[PDB]
Amino acid sequence: VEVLEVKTGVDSITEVECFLTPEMGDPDEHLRGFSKSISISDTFESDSPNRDMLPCYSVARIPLPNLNILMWEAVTLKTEVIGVTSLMNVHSNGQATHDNGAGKPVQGTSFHFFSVGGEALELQGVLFNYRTKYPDGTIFPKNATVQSQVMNTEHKAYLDKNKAYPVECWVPDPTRNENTRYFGTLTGGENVPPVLHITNTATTVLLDEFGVGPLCKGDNLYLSAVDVCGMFTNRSGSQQWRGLSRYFKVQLRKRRVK
Amino acid sequence: VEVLEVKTGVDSITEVECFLTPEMGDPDEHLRGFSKSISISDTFESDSPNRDMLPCYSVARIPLPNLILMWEAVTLKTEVIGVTSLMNVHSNGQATHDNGAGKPVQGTSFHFFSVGGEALELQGVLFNYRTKYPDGTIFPKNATVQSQVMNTEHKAYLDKNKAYPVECWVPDPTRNENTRYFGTLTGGENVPPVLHITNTATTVLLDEFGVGPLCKGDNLYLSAVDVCGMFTNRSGSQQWRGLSRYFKVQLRKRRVK
Amino acid sequence: VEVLEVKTGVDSITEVECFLTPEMGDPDEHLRGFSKSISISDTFESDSPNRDMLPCYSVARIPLPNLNILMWEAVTLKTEVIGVTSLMNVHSNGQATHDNGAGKPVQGTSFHFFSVGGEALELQGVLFNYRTKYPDGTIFPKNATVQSQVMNTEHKAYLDKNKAYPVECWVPDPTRNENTRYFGTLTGGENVPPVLHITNTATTVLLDEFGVGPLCKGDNLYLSAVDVCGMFTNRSGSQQWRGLSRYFKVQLRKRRVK
C-alpha cells in the first residue's frame, strides 16, 4: 500500500459509535459481568481453571460504508468505561471491612485495555504457568513448553472471536499490529483501588508518525477491549472478577491508496 | 443548529455563580451531608437499600437572561466547598488505635461535575440487577441480568433533585453532545481524600470546533456529585459524607440558524 | 478601580520576604508547633474541642512602602515549608512500629495552604458537625444550623487575626477573594505519608487572566498559611497535630489606578 491523499467533501467522513460488553465468565444466569468465584489449585502443576472463572478479550468487527482504491482511515477515538458508579454498591452481600462496617468495594488486580484497528488485533501467548490446563471452549496457547512462560513465538493468534481468548494467556503482539493502535494498563495487587475517570472532552488521535491512521481492510473496523475492574468479595470471603462495558466513538475519513 | 458568529459589546456576556449542595441521604434533622449508616444485605437477591442510604446526583437549572441567539458556556471555575471540615477527628469517631484520634473520612469517593445547555443525559448500570430500589428514587426500570453490563432501555434525564441514585446512573457517553462532564471514581475502603482548592484554575468548555454548550430555552444545567468518602462512628457503622460544589460559568451570546 | 499602566524605573519595584509560624494549639510552654493530644467525644452533640487542640489559620499583614493613585501589585511568589527534615526524628518517645523498631513518623491527615492578597483573605464557614461547641478565644461560625454542615451563607468572615480561626471551620470563600490568590491541598486518611518538596528554583506567577496581580489596599500585603503536616503519635498512642513554618518571597511593582 502506497498511501496517497485524503478525500474531502461532505461525503468523505463517517462515524462509528458503540459499546463492547465485558466477558468475565458469567457463572450463572444472574451474574453477567462477574466471573465464577476464584479457587486455588493444590499444586503448581495441577492448575486447572474452569471456563467461567476466566475473563476473556472482547471484540467487535464493525462494517463500514462500502467503498469500491479508497479505504476508511480511523483518525480519532473517544472511549470510556460505562457504569463506573455501580462500584459504589457496598450493601449487596459483601464482606464487611470491620464490625458493623460497610461492605468492601471492588478492588485489586485490574486490566484496562482497548484497541482500534483496520484488521483483527494480533495476539502473542504468554503463560504464568506452562502446565496450566486451560479449559474446553477457550482458545489458548497450544503445545506449551517451559519457554511459553517467557516467550514462545509459536503462540500467535488473531482476536477473531468472543468469549474465547482468556486475558491471562494473551497480549497484543508487539512484533506485529502495525495497522492497529492499542493501549493497556495492568495494575496488580489485592488491595489496588480502582481509579476510573470519565469525561466526554478527551480525544485520542490515532495517526502514526507519518500522519496515517489504521486503514480498514474490506471496509471493517476492529474494536477490542478488556475492563477487569477488580474483584468483588462476598460475605463468605470468596472473590469474583467484576468487569464493565466500554464505549467507543471513532471518526474515519476516506483515503486513496495504490 | 448551524453555529454562526459570536456577538460582542458590553451587553454580550454574562456570568453564573452558585453552589450545589450534596444529597447524601439526610437520615435525620441533624445529618444534612451524611447518608444513613450502611447495612449489608445477606444475599444478592435481598439487596434492598433504604432511600436515606443512597447518595443522589445534584442538579440545578439556572435561568439566563432572556434572548436567533443562544447563550454559550465558555469557561468554568469549580471547587469543593469545606474541604477542611474533614479535619474534625474528635467528633464521635472510631479511634485509629488505643488512645488515638478518630478516623477521618476516607474510602470510596466519586467526584463529578458537568455544565450543559440541557439536562445531563444518563445511562443506567446496576451492580446487581435484583437490587430493589426504594420508593422516592428514580432508578432503572424492567431491570434484567443484562442491566449489570449494558441495557440500552435505561435512559433518563437528570431532571430532578434527591431522585437519581449515584450507584445506578452514569452520564450516557452515547449522547451528551451539548454538555461537558468530568468525573473520577476512586474505590477502596482506605482511599485517602485528596482535595485541591484554588481560585486560579479555569476549565475551557469549548469543543474541538471552538463551540461551548448552547443553552436551550435560556437555561444552564449544572450537575454534581462529591461523595468524599465514609465517616466511621465509634460503633464502627459507616456513613457517606459529601460536600457542596462551587460553580462559576462565563457565557457569551452566539448566533445560530 | 480602573487598572492603568505599570510604573517603571529603579524606584518602582519592591520585595517582601518573611516566614509565618504555624499555630497548632501550643498546649504548654514546651510544645510550640504541636496541638494538644486529640480526644474524641462520645456523641456528636457533645463534641467540644479545647482551644489548644484546634490548629488555626496563620496570617500576616505586611506594611509596604507608603505611596499616596498608585498601588503595589503582587506579581510573583516563591514559597516553601521550613524544616521538613525535622520529621525524621523517629527516636523521641514515639510509638514503635513493631518490637524493637523505630518510632512512627508524623503522618496522617494534612492541610497545606497559602495565599497572597491585597486585603484580608475572605472565609466561608463549613462545619463537619453543626452541634460542635467551639471554644472561647476562637472565632467560629455563629448561629450554626444543620445547613452549616453543607453551606450556610451567613458564615462569612475575614482572616484578620492570629490564633483565632480554626482550620476545621473555615475555608477560602470561592464566591469572593477576587483580590487574592489562594492554593490548598487536603490529604485525609490516618496513614497518609507526608510528601514535602523544597527548592529555590520555583516561582508562582500571581497575575490573573488580564495580567493583573493582587492590588494592595492601604499599602498592606496579606499573607496566609496552614501547614498541618500530620499527627505525631506518642508511645502511649495519643496523637497531636504537628505543623511547620512557611517561607514567602513576594515581588511587587507599582501600578496606577483611577
Add this chain to the structure above:
Amino acid sequence: VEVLEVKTGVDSITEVECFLTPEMGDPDEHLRGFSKSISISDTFESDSPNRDMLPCYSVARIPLPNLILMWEAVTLKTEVIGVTSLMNVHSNGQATHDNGAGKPVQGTSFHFFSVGGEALELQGVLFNYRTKYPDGTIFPKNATVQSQVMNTEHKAYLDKNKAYPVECWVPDPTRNENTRYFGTLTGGENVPPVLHITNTATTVLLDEFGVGPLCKGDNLYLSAVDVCGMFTNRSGSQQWRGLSRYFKVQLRKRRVK
C-alpha cells in the same frame, strides 16, 4: 570521532526488532522466568545467596548490515511482553484471606532497558560487602566496606548473559556516553505492579547535539531487566517473577572521520 552528515536515500535506514528473555535464576526445568525461592541468612555476615536465586541483567548484541560510515540508533519502541499473565491468581498461590483468591505478583520491582553502540558499562554497589556471591556469577571482586557506598574498582561491561546479578550492578553514570539507559527501582513488599502497554509511544535516542548511539563494529547492544515482583506460593515461600522485553530500534547511516 568527528560526527559529520547523515546519509539519505532508500538504502540509508534499517530496523532492528527483537525480544530479550528475562534471567531470573531458572531453578529447574519447569520454572523459566522464576527465581529459586528466597531464603534469609542467619546472620548479616553469612549472607550467601545461591546462583538460581539471583536475577541477572539480560543483554543481546545484534549484528547490523555490514558497512567511514556507522549506524546511528535514532528511535526506540519498547514494552514488557505478557503483562496479563500476572492475572493468574489460581495457581497454588497464598490466599489473601479465608476463601480468597491467590496473592498476585507484587513487591520489589526493577524495570530497566538500554540501547547502545557498545556494551553497557557497569558500576558495582553492594548492599552488604560480606555477601558471598556464588560461583558462575560475575560480581564485584575484592569487596571492602567502601563497596557498600562507592568503590571505583568495581567496573565491568555487560558482556555476558546469566552472569551479572541485578543486586550488585548498576549502569555506571561516569561512563556510558555511547548508550542511552532508563530504569526504575520500586521497593517494598506490597508494591503493586503498574505495567503500561501501547504501540504508539516512541523514545528518541538523540543526545543534546542530535546524535544517537553510534554502533562500533556494526553491532547494536540491547540490555534489560524486568523483575516484576515476587510470586508467593501457598507455603509462603517467595520467588522473583520476570517477563520478556520487546525492542524496536530504527537506525540511519552516519559519516564520521
Add this chain to the structure above:
Amino acid sequence: EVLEVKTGVDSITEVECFLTPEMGDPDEHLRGFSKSISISDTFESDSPNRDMLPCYSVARIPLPNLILMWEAVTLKTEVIGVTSLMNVHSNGQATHDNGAGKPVQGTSFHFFSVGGEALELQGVLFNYRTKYPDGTIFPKNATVQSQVMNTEHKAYLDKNKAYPVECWVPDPTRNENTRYFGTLTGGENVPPVLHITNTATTVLLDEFGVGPLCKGDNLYLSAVDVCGMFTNRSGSQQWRGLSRYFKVQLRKRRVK
C-alpha cells in the same frame, strides 16, 4: 555586575564525581548504614547517639584557576546503586512465615544542591529539648521557638559527617548563589521509587540566565539520600543511604 559569557574551545569545563552518604557508620562493617534506632523513655530525654544520625554530605571541588568566574550551567545527577536494595536475603525480617526479607522502606529524604559557595542552612528542631551528641554541629541555644523558626540558627554546610539531617534545612532566605532540590517522603511503609537515566539534564540558570558563580574557583556540591530503613531479623531498624553522582557543566563568565 554580570557581563558576557566567554566563548572558544578553552571556555568550558566539566566536573564529574560522586558524594558518599554519611548515615552514621556504627562500626567498620556498616558504611552506608546508621546505628539501630532507639526510642527515648520520655520526650524531654531524647538523646540520640552520633552514629544514629544521618548527616548532609558536601564536597568542595576545585576548578581550573582563573575578572572571570566559572558559571554552573547544567546538572546531571542520580543515585548510585539502586539495585542493591533488592538484597532481601541478608538476615532481614521475614514478611511472613517462609517469606523473603522485608526490603528497605519507610521515611526517605533525597536532596541535592549545586552552588558557587557553601550551602546556607537554617535550623529547625522536632523537639527543642533533644540533646544532640558531641561531634555534631547542631542548633545552639535552642528554645521552644526552635520547634517552628528561630532565626539564630544559621550555619554553612562546610564540613562532612557533622550536620545532622533532622536539624537542618536549606535556608530559603539566603542561598541566592545555589540551586537546591529536595523531597521528604515520610511514613514507615513508604516504598522507595528511584529512577535512573543518563538522558535527563537540569538547567541551573536563574530567571535572568545566570547560573551559580563559583567564588575562589570552587564548586560546592551537597547531597542527602536516605533511602529508608533496613529492618533486621530482630526488628531493629537502621537508616540506609546511597551515593549520588553529579555531572556539572560550567562556562567562563566575565563580571566587574
